């Protein structure tokens, strides 16, 4: 019971007559700028002079300018910088230089949802969040519609990128931002890495060889997750051995008890929704990311890395 | 500090002069029989008359016989049947028909490690456990060496299958069996599915749209696990956004607390090592697998399946 | 908001042209065979040769045959044996002998719901579960409809038995089986007997005469339950003294606290729904019912039995 | 099992041909500048114009310059400023003015270990941490060795200061920084002051005169700690009365229980190692040190201060 929009719903007329400034040239900057030019919209990439990304962008054959300049001549500014760098670039280099009635666009809602960018009341503010006809759907959301055509423009932008093919889902900046932070913290990276680490340490402390601990706790994860990707949980259960399936159904809850886990995950979500997580992260970046650099180091020293590196080398032959 | 053996350590002379009976024709039977013939050892597949697998095996162009017959004329019997079916086929159709001084081989140690097969004292008993030169290493173990050449034969079998290329690791039936059950129960299927389900239910109960709950808790798992496969945990951390990395380092432990999780996983491992899990599973199969069929059904009804199916369909276009 | 079917909805044409084999001759076998003949369908009772039930069935004037024979000549087989004996009789004597496209019928869903009988794909599988025009309604359910007319046939069977008169309720094998086990365990036998025993022991240990403990804790139960049967709980409250009513409303919760009781009953229900109870009971019967025979004995020795027997004798005069 | 270096291992040739800028003129600035000139290396002190420290440094007969100027003409910059002031002085006045291939030196690792100073890749970065031939050993550590001679230079610096005499211990910035913070928090200041305060309050609340509470809980501490300094714990036990010794051995654990204390100290250490403490302190200084000024005041008002001041005055006569 959700509103899906396709290529047929989106009209490239709302973008093709507009100048798009792509700020930043990571994986996202690369792909955004690439697929836009190959759909016949004039793109300029805004970068800092004499950067590694400056030369990489010219090598891909794109028009490259300083950030302030790229913005001065743009109708849509698509901001594809790290969350922690966006607010400063907006204040110093986008806010003063973006034409009135212009559009300010995002791939992530974080800085707008948590008020690190308080955009001018005259701008359109929208987001296209991607996740040939490879089946990559996208989210689209509009925070602010000054012109009356933010949503058609955003939908056109998704068409011009190739995201409309598999379907564009309409949402809000709130729901995009809060579900992204939740996934990262509770499941995708935070929870999963802790579960693997506890598995590996359990076997190694019980005196099983580290090499075999690594195979049964890290290397074999891909096999399971590929099945979930293709055919969901019930497909995954169907394909695994009955012994595996029986163990899963009767001992999974002992590993990860449902009500306790749901309680702890509700606290993770509370800190996201309350703004406490955003505050923590914003302040962390004000003082040189001490905790990030400290944790990186402790986790890079973990015995699981030595064994992992040896076995991945051994397999590459 | 582990003993690795390569193609150069293995001598195909120990297998090429032997008749191999492959029992069963799942994915493993298919691959074992295939790669053996393409390395010039004479293979026969033992199957039950008029089965779906009988016709599929003839269609791949293999010599197919009843199980008793395939065993009567074999020097090595490689048993590639479900754990719960192996013991009965061994008792009724392998034990009476396998030549004295023959070899009985496995891909999984479960039935031998837990005494569901008590093999004759005259047999060799060994295992090759796989996980062109695609980097698929294997485990090898020898439970029983009557001939004095079980280990060279097993190593030759791994060569004849293409498992020697990326390296063969010598282990024991105990360590193969107990680490496999542990992975399935604590991490790969049991733990991971419970963590995803708690994530998804947390978001849906908090009023986020199920479609977006599904993207941030299930679909995005593949992206993370592909990075872990390629470059381990520290590679995965390196590639994710700093916001994701910060969340992982500061909230992962809140989702999955280390000492509590390790305690519960030690209980999972205790039930494996004590034989309690094997007993539970063996008895389950004596009475028509009531719990397996009951749980399957409850998990197939879960709301996560409806939303999963809709979105996977939508993406296939 | 439930689907009720009456005599008018059921067409005896769907049964009267069919041969019915009734397997077993307890209370249910007796009544099923009886009421069918008195509605003009030809019945045969299948029994083991030279049993006590064999002679009792001939004495009621029914055609009696060995089980295999009764099945060979039947279109509908109605299985009215103890849950623990059904699976073996199905495997050895019904499966080989029941015509293709035949109907296999039950009064209880237990063996089908928990896969102790895995019925042939060509059979109809349905159930009639009864609980002159005495007001005995029935449940009806269809597990498997090969012919396209399982449900009309089942409904006809209920008509031919006299169960349609007070109404036939359509349900599923799942809901019949799981609610029956729940009632037996949590309330009807399990809970109620424990509550009586705790009452009786409380009074006797407090030094009240056992005879009077027995009257106020066991004999008087019938008076209350007859009122609940006739006029429900609010009828029962209406008829009891205001002192009794006041005590009930203000101390019932102290005896049986609501949230704690509901928690424990949810665990009883979980073990039913998960298949754990079915497994426990199936395995119990594989090894000669040690726990059943042990508990019987301990409960038959209970002081409540001596006093009960004396007072029931005294009242029969 | 630790690497000790003496005067004989250190070659003053690595420092005597280099210009040293000492930034700051506390106790450490004073001593560093002093002992360097008296070992024949040319020193300049960098200070802010018209400060109290400016005039005090000229009065000791040292060449004094603005910070930017002192750095422009230096080969080694020794930073002896409060931890909270170092990062700003590095960014604004050292980073732009320090010659390429220069050396940046510290007495404390805090700002480098926690990334408040991210030093240029061309610099040497090392530390000498002191704790006639008075027995003052030193630590030495090298964070960054661009020239290939950071360690000999650092060792020479320790020689030129008089720290080599009692021995220089090679360590890391990590171990110097984390052990210093731990000592301050768990034992030296944090723990010890809390233990004294609880002792004093216990006696005063029990109605002993405050003067005598002060003698038995504060004044007598010096006697014990002087013995520990000279002859360690077993020397201290040896010199105290047997009654004191018996009380210590049988009631010390009641005051300060071992496993509980070790648990709490592991949490103190965790917050240090994780970067949480550094973040807390860095942010505190961004907003005018509210907690520091608040706590100072509450602790200065404590009744222990009034009694202390009276008795110290009384003893000075």
From Swiss-Prot, chains A, B, C, D:
Mg(2+) 1 binds at residues 180, 184. Residues 2-171 form the KARI N-terminal Rossmann domain. The keyword Signal does not apply. Transmembrane segments: none annotated. One of its GO terms (cellular component) is cytosol. Pfam families: KARI_C, KARI_N. The active site is at 108. Substrate binds at residue 241. Pathway: Amino-acid biosynthesis; L-isoleucine biosynthesis; L-isoleucine from 2-oxobutanoate: step 2/4; Amino-acid biosynthesis; L-valine biosynthesis; L-valine from pyruvate: step 2/4. Keywords: Amino-acid biosynthesis, Branched-chain amino acid biosynthesis, Magnesium, Metal-binding, NADP, Oxidoreductase. Mg(2+) 2 binds at residues 180, 216, 220. It comes from the Bacteria. Binds 2 magnesium ions per subunit. Its EC number is 1.1.1.86. GO terms for molecular function: ketol-acid reductoisomerase activity; magnesium ion binding; NADP binding. Residues 172-315 form the KARI C-terminal knotted domain. Its cofactor is Mg(2+). It catalyses: (2R)-2,3-dihydroxy-3-methylbutanoate + NADP(+) = (2S)-2-acetolactate + NADPH + H(+); (2R,3R)-2,3-dihydroxy-3-methylpentanoate + NADP(+) = (S)-2-ethyl-2-hydroxy-3-oxobutanoate + NADPH + H(+). One of its GO terms (biological process) is isoleucine biosynthetic process. It is an enzyme of class 1 (oxidoreductase). NADP(+) binds at residues 25-28, 48, 51, 53, 83-86. NCBIfam families: ilvC (TIGR00465), PRK05479.1 (NF004017), PRK13403.1 (NF009940). Belongs to the ketol-acid reductoisomerase family. Involved in the biosynthesis of branched-chain amino acids (BCAA). Catalyzes an alkyl-migration followed by a ketol-acid reduction of (S)-2-acetolactate (S2AL) to yield (R)-2,3-dihydroxy-isovalerate. In the isomerase reaction, S2AL is rearranged via a Mg-dependent methyl migration to produce 3-hydroxy-3-methyl-2-ketobutyrate (HMKB). In the reductase reaction, this 2-ketoacid undergoes a metal-dependent reduction by NADPH to yield (R)-2,3-dihydroxy-isovalerate. This is Ketol-acid reductoisomerase (NADP(+)). It comes from Thermus thermophilus (strain ATCC BAA-163 / DSM 7039 / HB27). The gene is ilvC.
